[PDB]
Amino acid sequence: RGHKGERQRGTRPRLGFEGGQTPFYIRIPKYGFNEGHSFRRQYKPLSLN
Amino acid sequence: ISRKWEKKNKIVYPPQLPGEPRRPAEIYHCRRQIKYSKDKMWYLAKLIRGMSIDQALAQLEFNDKKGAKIIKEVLLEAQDMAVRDHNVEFRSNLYIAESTSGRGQCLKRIRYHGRGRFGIMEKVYCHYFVKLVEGPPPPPEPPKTAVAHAKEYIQQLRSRTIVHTL
Amino acid sequence: LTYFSARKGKRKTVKAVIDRFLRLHCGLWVRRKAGYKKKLWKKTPARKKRLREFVFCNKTQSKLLDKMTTSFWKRRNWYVDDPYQKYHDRTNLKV
Amino acid sequence: FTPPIYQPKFKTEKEF
Amino acid sequence: LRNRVTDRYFRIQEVLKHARHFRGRKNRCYRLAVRTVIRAFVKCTKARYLKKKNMRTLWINRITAASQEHGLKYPALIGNLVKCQVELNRK
Amino acid sequence: ADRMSKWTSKRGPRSFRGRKGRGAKGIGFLTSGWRFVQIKEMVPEFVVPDLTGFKLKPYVSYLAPESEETPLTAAQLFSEAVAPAIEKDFKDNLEKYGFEPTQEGKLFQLYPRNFLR
Amino acid sequence: VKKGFRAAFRFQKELERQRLLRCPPP
Amino acid sequence: NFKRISYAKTKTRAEVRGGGRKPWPQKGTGRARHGSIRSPLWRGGGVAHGPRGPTSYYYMLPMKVRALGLKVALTVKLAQDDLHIMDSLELPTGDPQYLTELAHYRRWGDSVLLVDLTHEEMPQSIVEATSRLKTFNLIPAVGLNVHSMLKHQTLVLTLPTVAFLEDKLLWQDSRYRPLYPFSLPYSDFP
Amino acid sequence: IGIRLTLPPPKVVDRWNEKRAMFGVYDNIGILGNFEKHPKELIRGPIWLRGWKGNELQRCIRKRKMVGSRMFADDLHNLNKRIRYLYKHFNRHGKFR
Amino acid sequence: PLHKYPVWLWKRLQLREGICSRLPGHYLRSLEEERTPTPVHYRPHGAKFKINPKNGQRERVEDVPIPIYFPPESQRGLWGGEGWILGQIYANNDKLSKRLKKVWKPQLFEREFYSEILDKKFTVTVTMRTLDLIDEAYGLDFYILKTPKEDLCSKFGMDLKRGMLLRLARQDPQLHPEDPERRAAIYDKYKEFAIPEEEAEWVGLTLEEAIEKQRLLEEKDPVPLFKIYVAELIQQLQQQALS
Amino acid sequence: ARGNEYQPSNIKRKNKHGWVRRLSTPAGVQVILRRMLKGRKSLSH
RNA sequence: GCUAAACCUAGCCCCAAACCCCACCUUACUACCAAACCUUAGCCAAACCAUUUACAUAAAGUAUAGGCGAUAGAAAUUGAUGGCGCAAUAGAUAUAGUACCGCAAGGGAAAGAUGAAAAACAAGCAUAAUAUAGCAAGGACUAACCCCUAUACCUUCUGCAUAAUGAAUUAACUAGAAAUAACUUUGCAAGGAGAGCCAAAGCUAAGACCCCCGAAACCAGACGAGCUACCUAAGAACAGCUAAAAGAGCACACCCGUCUAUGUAGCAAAAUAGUGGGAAGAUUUAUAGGUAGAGGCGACAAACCUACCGAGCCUGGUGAUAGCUGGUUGUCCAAGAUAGAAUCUUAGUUCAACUUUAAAUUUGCCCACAGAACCCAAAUCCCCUU
RNA sequence: ACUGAACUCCUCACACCCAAUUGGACCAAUCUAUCACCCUAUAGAAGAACUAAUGUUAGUAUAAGUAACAUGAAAACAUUCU
RNA sequence: UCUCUUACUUUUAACCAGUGAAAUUGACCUGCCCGUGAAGAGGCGGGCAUAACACAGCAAGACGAGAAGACCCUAUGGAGCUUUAAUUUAUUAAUGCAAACACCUGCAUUAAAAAUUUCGGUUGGGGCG
Ligand SMILES: Nc1nc2c(ncn2[C@@H]2O[C@H](COP(=O)(O)OP(=O)(O)OP(=O)(O)O)[C@@H](O)[C@H]2O)c(=O)[nH]1
Ligand SMILES: [Mg+2]
Ligand SMILES: [Mg+2]
Ligand SMILES: [Mg+2]
Ligand SMILES: [Mg+2]
Ligand SMILES: [Mg+2]
Ligand SMILES: [Mg+2]
Ligand SMILES: [Mg+2]
Ligand SMILES: [Mg+2]
Ligand SMILES: [Mg+2]
Ligand SMILES: [Mg+2]
Ligand SMILES: [Mg+2]
Ligand SMILES: [Mg+2]
Ligand SMILES: [Mg+2]
Ligand SMILES: [Mg+2]
Ligand SMILES: [Mg+2]
Ligand SMILES: [Mg+2]
Ligand SMILES: [Mg+2]
Ligand SMILES: [Mg+2]
Ligand SMILES: [Mg+2]
Ligand SMILES: [Mg+2]
Ligand SMILES: [Mg+2]
Ligand SMILES: [Mg+2]
Ligand SMILES: [Mg+2]
Ligand SMILES: [Mg+2]
Ligand SMILES: [Mg+2]
Ligand SMILES: [Mg+2]
Ligand SMILES: [Mg+2]
Ligand SMILES: [Mg+2]
Ligand SMILES: [Mg+2]
Ligand SMILES: [Mg+2]
Ligand SMILES: [Mg+2]
Ligand SMILES: [Mg+2]
Ligand SMILES: [Mg+2]
Ligand SMILES: [Mg+2]
């Protein structure tokens, strides 16, 4: 478990935390990549092969 | 707890052949749970180790320690049982081969101290053991004389070998 | 994140990741460049063009996003006219 | 100040 | 107490048997015996170098004694034997 | 500080000790000046019978035959006390046979019981 | 008491060995 | 293992009775710091990492894997000459001594697992004989399993049981993906 | 002295008592019975973990969900506390993230 | 261990056991049945489905009632299902601000109401909602007889309901004595609410009150065994005489 | 100087920790209920 | 050979099934006199904190909510015969909610072992004190010591015999719980799976992976004014002398506690001896009652509120939290040590760098010429051969 | 010249000397399946291993037979005396 | 009190007899000088010394034993207090507008009273950053 510190104490920060620096997964702007994904229609492909 | 000392009187040896030295008698006696520190009892035990029964009784009769009276009673009981049951011909022909003091079962009490604190008093009890062997007391180990002691030195010199070689 | 939800005992998804990143089924994560909508009046055309692009993520960043999102977001989606359908798979990749 | 602590009494009022 | 150790007696004895000849509580108390037993074994291991070192020193001293009894000095004796191709060692 | 020992009249201060009793049933009341007025009717009167000529004894000879216990029941008592009269009068208003509509008016009311033992 | 048989058997063997060493048979 | 449900459980420091107050202040007492008389370090305290509640060990191997295991067991018995095929389990008498003597004479193992097609049609003679025997166990065809086949030295099968097992085990080979549980109706599955 | 001075009473195990002899029978009830019964239906035990497995937190959640209403007062309080503590442990403590 | 039944079914089990079992069926059914009260402090959703503007999808919507606290004073009056709202607010109506405990209380008025069926004038602490409901029902008697228990939400209101229903069921001449025409007119006007007296007796009774009523109904000083044995012996003797 | 804070008096004892006072308020009734649930021999002082 | 050692069953744990005479609310256990219902909060997480933060299967961790962040999170729809438990420091706290502790709430133990019949080897010591010199042993030796070699252990450290921490010692108990994606091993295979889910060799199953003790604290509900602060009712005490009607003087009882000495685990968790202030008053004091903790009371000393009050005590949330301290238990082998950046951040953490493991294929290092700036040295980089 | 290492050679044998971390081969004891039947084997499991937490409980040491404690005198044990 | 301390009595004390704790304690076969060293050594290097043990004193050392001392610093630890620190007015007191025909309720505004929470970092001892 290492020597002292949060990692040995078992209390290191949450995943995605960067020690107080604005995390990577939050400094990227929000974009509608997955907007309405649950409402987009999906069709299984059926190749002629 | 252990009570082997009492059993030690119940060992029966096989009959001795006529051409065999007479086996000296041996009597194991003890008193259990004496209200006396085993450390204090040990001094009396050591005092009477190796002495004749009569000499030990005389020494204990004029000793101021409380354990002296208890040891005298134990020795008198040992003498009585030795004569009655262990076929010891003469009362005085007995010497204390072994005499030791053993720790007994003790009780814990509280001693109140000054500031609401306390200590654990121990109501100390001790056992006392004696073996009486028939026959005159063994002679005291004579101090080694210069002759024998230089003999030992010369033997040590002769025992030397050429170490760490063929 | 929540490694075990209190109601289902399942692993939860950091919806902040879903709101920001697109996962190609191959394993690549796509993102917009930070500041692509900020103070464009003081940015050169080359800088604006660089910012307006869709950019892949590092190996470690992709691993972080995969940990932060659950398996539902890592499935095959046969959407009707997905602009990223071609990009969902890798071709001629050697190691 | 810290108050003194008393142990349980049975430990000391045990008897044969 | 699903699983309890039952061999601790023998685990202790394995160490205490090596400490039975020590002094003081080191031969009875395991907490103390184990430390000394480890030190005893480490010394035993490191002493194989010193045994060889002292044997050569002892041999050199004895050879010097004899060569002085014959009026020679150990360096002269050893060097001249080597030059004579007498490959006798110090032991 | 003694919570376990029973609470008696020997424990509290003078007022407590005076007030609490030992279960002895009261005999009267207290008037002005703490003068106790004893009511004669409140004193239980021991109705001791004349034992002269009585043949029974505290013990019974072991020679007596053994019998089967048959605890008395309301039905058995009715059969043994009322049934004969009822039959004799029917073959030929229940107060005639013994029944009383209400215990009120009786010195020894059966319920609520108003007599000792 | 500790459930098990192997430690007890080993201890019995050690006791037997010590008893034999203390009072070897004729 | 899959049936196993260990009922072992221990009380954690939270579930142990009492242990709410701090045994003594942090400082000044001269004793080790403590927060409750029921922490794992204390005598009578909770168990830090002990068995927790009734735990299940349930897991399912693929039905193809389980059928393959049954097949492998049958092949092993046949190859090792512990598999005996019978026309029927009918016995001349329901006396267990007869069955034991027959097995001993035919050099069957100390343990025999007899299998019949269905529970209802099993002959009364063999039923009576095997009801009083410990090492001779009679089971229906549906009850055949690797564990019992291995535990019993010899395996006795009737011809109908052989046909039934062949059909059932081979059906696993050459079957589609399950569109839905096979308990549900299928075009060709009884 | 943590060693017993006498051999423990001999432990005789009957390997051919009915339970051991018939152990495992009908484990193939499904594949050998037209799949009418799933083998997990042969499992006898607590209702909330019949044919289901999970870590302690999942087990506690399932117990509360399925028999929480029928639990005793203090047992249910202990289960709620255990669920809270297990949530905290599994979601905030550990070597990895 | 585990209780055989869920703890929340213990009340129903206790209803099915004991004097509650002996309670009349209609009253037990009235207790068991529970209907959601009419919305008062919240606007119900128009339909069961809605097109949420965020994603333009048809989503189900449910009407979750606001918990209402009814202080004991309400049981002595007629509040039209209105009560205290014990909730919380965000200072300045922005969630990023502080959260404060807020109690909304109805405006209570003292008003006098005349009951035609009871021919009595009652002074009652009342709410404007109750007045509006009375106006809609076209009178206090109509309001009482129409409003169900849940919507009425008042022990005094339910007692008034029981009184009116008993009056109707008995056709009591005590309603405007020496005026049979007027009494008949009133009874005809409120005819539609008439129910059997055996049922009207138990309208609006709490569980404890119903238990007390049943206990008083079924309490009988035990018949002396003298009478029973006399009857049995007379019957047996009659049988013997016949045979 | 300290330690003897207890100056016994049965009147105060009963008026402060008696059965009547414990039943006087709902809280004390719950005190007695807790003692009964725990099985205390002495429910009230 | 003493102390002692052991033992097997008292019981308990998890499931299943099944729904369980008299006295006594007054001072309880005393024979008998004219009035309930009303949002939990807080810790904690967000690395602070202020909005916020969990209390059958599948859909699905999806739609949604959210300082849109920590996290929270549906619904439509689907249909659903016991112990690889403990066995007296364990298992219930339990032999018992007893003893004992506290005014009260409340806290809360320990331990027993023969027989068919009782009408039969730890430590510590002693046997046996001790011989120059030395981490107490090792090499040895004929020989215990003598001779030569040897700076206890753990933890924390750049570095500890260190005169840095812990440890008297024996026995017992006492501390790594798990998803994601990987890897290995099977099964089947463009399909896998016992509905749902995944699939551009996948899929199913298994194996393997994440500790213990400790705060001051916060909130909720109880219990406390038999101590003490103040007050209420109705009581009591104040010798003697002087002065006369005194918040007067000297000085007993009484109250207090100026100074000194003793005591400092004490006689005492605040005392003793002497000395001293008041001692008819705003005095001292017995009895009962009252004020209760985001409160009381206070001639304000932040005094007192049951010996530890800048905010009581008990229980509960609670196994609070702790980037801090300490601890983290079988054998053996192998690889294995520091470029930096950001951070309410420098006692920490994320990334990078270094390191480990497994796999793929192909150049890696060393390095000959040639080559790398004008302004205004050592060397380095690149680099075929080798 | 000689002395001088765990450097090197020599006879034999070789995985057998780095903190954190990481890989691997084994394994004490317990229970379960099946063996075994003077103590075991192949597997499955887990409250699975203590020279250390001013660790908890119990025992006994050290300080230490130390600090500390106590009974006015004689006597006929009637009594008297200080 | 002291120059300047002395004499005696009691207690304590020491010995004999009974009873019998506490902090403390890694193991100890527990020396001095110089040097060395995590920087002031009984334990390491070079010298010196050195039979074995009790008993009574002493307090120079064992950086002596007692409270994870006193003092200082740190913690995205607390808590008490003050405020023109931030956020509020849930609560009371006022008014105003509604509702009803002064009281009650709802909504506003102003105060009093409080409540929650915080008090960044690197540098600077004789400053005024
Ligand atoms: N799993 C489990 N089975 C139990 C438990 N108690 C009893 N049984 C089972 O109950 C069954 C019947 O017990 P018996 O004593 O033979 O009969 P019984 O007295 O009629 O049984 P019950 O009606 O259960 O009281 C047996 O199979 C027992 O093993 C229990 O606590 N758990
Ligand atoms: Mg550490
Ligand atoms: Mg005291
Ligand atoms: Mg608790
Ligand atoms: Mg326990
Ligand atoms: Mg007083
Ligand atoms: Mg926080
Ligand atoms: Mg126990
Ligand atoms: Mg010993
Ligand atoms: Mg040290
Ligand atoms: Mg330190
Ligand atoms: Mg120490
Ligand atoms: Mg008072
Ligand atoms: Mg006077
Ligand atoms: Mg005066
Ligand atoms: Mg005052
Ligand atoms: Mg001041
Ligand atoms: Mg001050
Ligand atoms: Mg206090
Ligand atoms: Mg913690
Ligand atoms: Mg290496
Ligand atoms: Mg910042
Ligand atoms: Mg050499
Ligand atoms: Mg080498
Ligand atoms: Mg363990
Ligand atoms: Mg140990
Ligand atoms: Mg320890
Ligand atoms: Mg001693
Ligand atoms: Mg001394
Ligand atoms: Mg003394
Ligand atoms: Mg003495
Ligand atoms: Mg020095
Ligand atoms: Mg001395
Ligand atoms: Mg030292
Ligand atoms: Mg400190």
- A33, C21 Cβ separation under 8 angstroms: yes
- CA separation for the pair H161, H116 (Å, rounded): 6
- K44, K23 Cβ separation under 8 angstroms: no
DSSP, res K1? -
**What residues make up the domain containing K33?**
3-45
- CA separation for the pair H9, B3 (Å, rounded): 45
Instruction: Give the residue on D whose Cα is nearest the Cα of H24.
Output: D5
- For chain F, the maximum distance between any two Cα atoms, rounded to a whole number of angstroms, is 78
> If phi over 0 gives left and psi between -120 and 50 gives alpha, with beta otherwise, what is residue H159?
alpha
Does residue F112 have a cis bond before it (omega within 30 degrees)?
yes
Token digits for F35?
């003068």
Determine if strand N comes within 7 Å of the CB of H30: yes
| Helix, coil or strand: residue I48 | helix
- CA separation for the pair B59, B43 (Å, rounded): 13
Indicate the length of chain C as a whole number.
95
* Domain at B1-166, CATH homologous superfamily: Ribosomal protein L22/L17 (3.90.470.10)
Nearest to K45 by CA among K11, K22, K7, K17: K17
H96-107 as b/e: b if 16+ CB within 10 A? beebbeebeeee
Experimental technique? cryo-EM
- C86, C42 Cβ separation under 8 angstroms: no
DSSP, res H45? -
Indicate the length of chain B as a whole number.
166
Query: Which among G11, G12, G17, G21 is the top mutation candidate for probing chain E, defined by the most E β-carbons within 10 Å of its own β-carbon?
Result: G11
I39-50 as b/e: b if 16+ CB within 10 A? bbebbebbebbb
Instruction: Please enumerate, as own/partner, the contacts of J150-154 that have beta carbons within 8 Å and a separation of 24 or more.
Output: J150/J34, J150/J35, J150/J36, J150/J37, J150/J38, J150/J81, J151/J37, J151/J38, J151/J80, J151/J81, J152/J78, J152/J81, J153/J37, J153/J70, J153/J74, J153/J79, J153/J81, J153/J83, J154/J74, J154/J75, J154/J77, J154/J78, J154/J79
CA of K4 to C1' of L241 (A): 40
What residues of chain E lie within 8 A of the CB of G8, using their CB? 6
Nearest to F82 by CA among H97, J231, H95: J231
- N- to C-terminal Cα separation, chain J: 63
Rounded to 10 deg, the angle between the E30-69 and E8-19 helix axes is 30
Token digits for B63?
């000793």
- CA separation for the pair J152, J160 (Å, rounded): 11
Q: Name the domain count of chain E.
A: 1
Q: How far is the CA of E32 from the centre of ligand 27 (A)?
A: 14
How many Cβ atoms sit within 10 Å of the Cβ of residue I81? 14
The β-bridge relationship of strands C29-32 and C22-23 is antiparallel
Q: What is the dihedral of CA J129, J130, J131, J136, to 10 degrees?
A: 90
Nearest to B38 by CA among B125, B121, B129, B131: B125
Token digits for C35?
């500041």
DSSP, res A42? B
- H27, H7 Cβ separation under 8 angstroms: no
CA of B91 to C1' of L4 (A): 36
- J131, J111 Cβ separation under 8 angstroms: yes
- B95, B57 Cβ separation under 8 angstroms: no
- CA separation for the pair C64, A16 (Å, rounded): 7
- CA separation for the pair E13, J56 (Å, rounded): 80
Q: Name the domain count of chain K.
A: 1
- CA separation for the pair I26, J167 (Å, rounded): 71
- CA separation for the pair J75, J160 (Å, rounded): 12
Beta pairing partners, C31: C55
- A27, C34 Cβ separation under 8 angstroms: yes
Token digits for J21?
């079992």
Token digits for H38?
């029921």
Q: Is the dihedral of CA E3, E8, E10, E11 positive or negative?
A: positive
Determine if strand N comes within 7 Å of the CB of J106: yes
Query: Which single residue is written with the structure tokens 């086949």?
Result: H149
- Provide the positions of strand N that have an atom within 7 A of a protein CB: 16-24, 26-29, 66-69, 76, 87-91, 99-101, 104-107
Q: Which of C20, C30, C36 sits opposite A25 (nearest CB)?
A: C20
Domain map of chain I by residue range?
Answer: 1-96
SS3 annotation, chain B = CCCHHHHHHHCCCCCCCCCCCCCCCEEEEEEEEECCCHHHHHHHHHHHCCCEHHHHHHHHHCCCCHHHHHHHHHHHHHHHHHHHCCCCCCCCCEEEEEEEEEECCCEEEEEECCCCCEEEEEECCEEEEEEEEECCCCCCCCCCCHHHHHHHHHHHHHCCCCCCCC
Q: Subunits touching A (CB < 8 Å, at least 3 pairs)?
A: C, I, J
Nearest to I51 by CA among I61, I37, I36, I64: I37
- CA separation for the pair J107, J112 (Å, rounded): 16
Domain map of chain B by residue range?
Answer: 1-166
Q: Which nucleotide is nearest to B113 (CA to C1')?
A: L265
- Provide the positions of strand M that have an atom within 7 A of a protein CB: 1-6, 20-21, 28-36, 39-40, 44-61, 65, 67
Which whole-number Å values give the CA distances from F30 to B78, E51, F15, F16, F41, in the listed order?
Answer: 80, 113, 16, 17, 16
- B1, B32 Cβ separation under 8 angstroms: no
SS3 annotation, chain C = CCCCCCCCCCCCCCHHHHCCCEECCCCCEEEECCCCCCCHHHCCHHHHHHHCCEEECCHHHHHHHHHHCCHHHHCCCCECCCCCCHHHCCCCCCC
Q: Which of A16, A34, A43 sits opposite C64 (nearest CB)?
A: A16
Residue F66 has, within 13 A of its CA and on its CB side, a CA count of 1
Beta pairing partners, H113: H137, H155
DSSP, res I33? T
| Helix, coil or strand: residue I21 | helix
Query: Which single residue is written with the structure tokens 């302690």?
Result: I56
Report the nearest residue to nucleotide L109, CA vs C1': D8
- H140, I17 Cβ separation under 8 angstroms: no
Nominal resolution in Å?
2.9
DSSP string, F69-97: -----HHHHHHHHTHHHHHHHHH---GGG
CA angle J113, J119, J123 (to 5 degrees): 25
CA of B114 to C1' of L271 (A): 11
Q: Is A1 exposed, middle or buried (0-12, 13-18, 19+ CB in 10 A)?
A: exposed
Query: Which single residue is written with the structure tokens 């892949």?
Result: C56
Contact exists between C and I (3 or more beta carbon pairs < 8 Å):
yes
What residues of chain B lie within 8 A of the CB of E62, using their CB? 165
SS3 annotation, chain J = CECCCCHHHHHHHHHHCCHHHHCCHHHHHHHHCCCCCCCCCCCCCCCCEEEECCCCEEEECCCCCCCCECCHHHHCCECCCCCEEEEEEEHHHCCCCCEEEEEECCCEEEEEEEECCCCEEEEEEEEHHHHHHHHHHCCHHHHHHHCCHHHHCCHHHHHHHHHHHHHHHHCCCCCCCCCHHHHHHHHHHCHHHCCCHHHHCCCCCCHHHHHHHHHHHHCCCCCCHHHHHHHHHHHHHHHHHHC
Question: In what order do the strands lie in the sheet containing B126-134?
Answer: B26-34, B126-134, B94-103
Asked if the Cβ–Cβ distance from D16 to B115 is below 8 Å, we say: no
